[PDB]
Design a binder for this molecule. Structure first.
Ligand SMILES: O=C(c1n[nH]c2ncc(Br)cc12)N1CCCN(C2CC2)S1(=O)=O
Length: 167
């Protein structure tokens, strides 16, 4: 039993809800919140900009130190950093950004990072400003993640479409 509330169950291990991931994280304080990161951990917009803003820029400060030490992530890769006031940990995961020409096949590799964590609150990888089809992202999620994932979809119109079209 966990504290996530109001989710629709899609599969044995994947759950979905129309919710703002920032407000969901603040309420649940999950062990792991997933950020829709880029390789530079520059949290300017989309999910990342919103999560960072909610930490009062502490996520960005921590991220800049991480990059100064380690260099950029790989597309499809991840790192574990603090969750600040939102979660115990933040798993920064880099899905391919279609608006940069990156290979959509890397989306499966990106979701594989979720399997290192028993339970996660997460957005759909590569959706929103990363330019991929969210229906496809949900399909890859369900077919790749084996751990328990609670997906927050900000747009109510998109949420209804994802549910109604889910196979
Ligand atoms: O939640 C957001 C989101 N995008 N910009 C934001 N700004 C502030 C806050 Br708070 C949340 C967001 N989505 C990111 C894109 C992928 N998803 C869409 C496809 C269904 S999403 O995972 O629903």
């Amino acid at each position: 039993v966990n504290s996530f509330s109001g989710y629709l169950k899609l599969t044995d291990n994947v759950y979905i809800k129309n919710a703002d991931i920032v407000e969901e994280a603040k309420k649940v304080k999950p062990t792991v919140v997933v950020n829709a990161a880029n390789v530079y951990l520059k949290h300017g917009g989309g999910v990342a900009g919103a999560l960072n803003k909610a930490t009062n820029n502490a996520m960005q400060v921590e991220s800049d130190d991480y990059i100064a030490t380690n260099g950029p992530l790989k597309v499809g890769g991840s790192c574990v950093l603090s969750g600040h006031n939102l979660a115990k940990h933040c798993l920064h995961v880099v899905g391919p950004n279609v608006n940069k020409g990156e290979d959509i096949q890397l989306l499966k590799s990106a979701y594989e990072n979720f399997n290192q964590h028993e339970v996660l609150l997460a957005p759909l990888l590569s959706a929103g400003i990363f330019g991929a089809d969210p229906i496809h992202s949900l399909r890859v999620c369900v077919d790749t993640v084996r751990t328990n994932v609670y997906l927050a979809v900000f747009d109510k119109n998109l949420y209804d479409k994802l549910v109604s079209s889910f196979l």
